[PDB]
């Protein structure tokens, strides 16, 4: 019964208008159950090739996601990797994650989604996604999303040179095989490797590792970044998880970039959202979405 093409058409109809799209509950449940199968059939550490486009946090800003595809090209015109945090804070987490899961189902080798720290029941129960599910559908539907999120991949490597994850590095990360050995479904624990990949931050005033101001995980300095790239023969860390004025921001002499794709985040910031294009030779460039004032 699941009509993916129809679902996508309905979701995309609203372009040019914060109007809602009201799918059937059994349609949304279907998106979760089919996408969960695909997530589990693919590696937890994704190995990807350029060219592709990479986006950071969306946080339910559905019309801003549409604007990203409008300028980047709708799938499969371009390959996409998203770095997590699809839900919470914004007004339309449901439309947002539904469109992303529909595209994952339609183009599973051209379209990729990583886990953010908000794709976690203990977080998105509180920061809006649960409230949105309960209001528009019911609790059962929220529990179905949780079951799906628990199977999302955690990291990706593009052409063996760009390591991507939502949060950042971990003092525990010595071998990529460690990520590969993480079994799914899993919740995000309160500490340890998986926690750090979704929660850690770079910090220019830290030498080595430090306690993170969020109260979760760690901060890491520029030389941690350098040693990591050299040890694993990588060129770049690409991550999200922090709002940044221009939508992208370099760290440690461009050995790390932060991407953030929710313009005017929450309405509480004046930030642009950005997307990073990686062309076939790994030349990276940025497109910026900027709310009028």
């Amino acid at each position: 019964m699941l009509n993916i093409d129809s679902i996508i058409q309905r979701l995309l109809e609203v372009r040019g208008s914060g109007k809602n799209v009201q799918l059937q509950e059994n349609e949304i449940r279907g998106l979760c159950l089919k996408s969960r199968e695909i997530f589990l059939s693919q590696p937890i550490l994704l190995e990807l090739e350029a060219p592709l486009k990479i986006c950071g946090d969306i946080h339910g800003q559905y019309y801003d996601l549409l604007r990203l595809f409008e300028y980047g090209g709708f799938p499969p015109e371009s390959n996409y990797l998203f770095l997590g945090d699809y839900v919470d804070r914004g007004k339309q987490s449901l439309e947002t994650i539904c469109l992303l899961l529909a595209y994952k189902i339609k183009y599973p080798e051209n379209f990729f989604l990583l886990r953010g720290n908000h794709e976690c029941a203990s977080i998105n129960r509180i920061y809006g996604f649960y409230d949105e599910c309960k209001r528009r559908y019911n609790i059962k539907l929220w529990k179905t999303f949780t079951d799906c999120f628990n199977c999302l991949p955690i990291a990706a490597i593009v052409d063996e040179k760009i390591f991507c994850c939502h949060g950042g590095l971990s003092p525990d990360l010595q071998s990529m095989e460690q990520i590969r050995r993480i079994m799914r479904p899993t919740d995000v624990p309160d500490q340890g490797l998986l926690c750090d990949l979704l929660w850690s931050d770079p910090d220019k005033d830290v030498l080595g590792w430090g306690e993170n101001d969020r109260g979760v995980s760690f901060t890491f300095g520029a030389e941690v970044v350098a040693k990591f790239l050299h040890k694993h023969d990588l060129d770049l860390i690409c991550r999200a998880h922090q709002v940044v004025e221009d939508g992208y921001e370099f760290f440690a002499k461009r050995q790390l970039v932060t991407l953030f794709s929710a313009p005017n985040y929450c309405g509480e910031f004046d930030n642009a959202g950005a997307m990073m294009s990686v062309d076939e030779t790994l030349m990276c460039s940025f497109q910026i979405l900027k709310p009028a004032e």
Partner: peptide, 24 residues
Amino acid sequence: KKVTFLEEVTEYYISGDEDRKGPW
């Protein structure tokens, strides 16, 4: 395969007369 960066960045004005906050 070597990561490089383009100097030019492309900007677009988008809707600022829009609701982006949600209840929680």
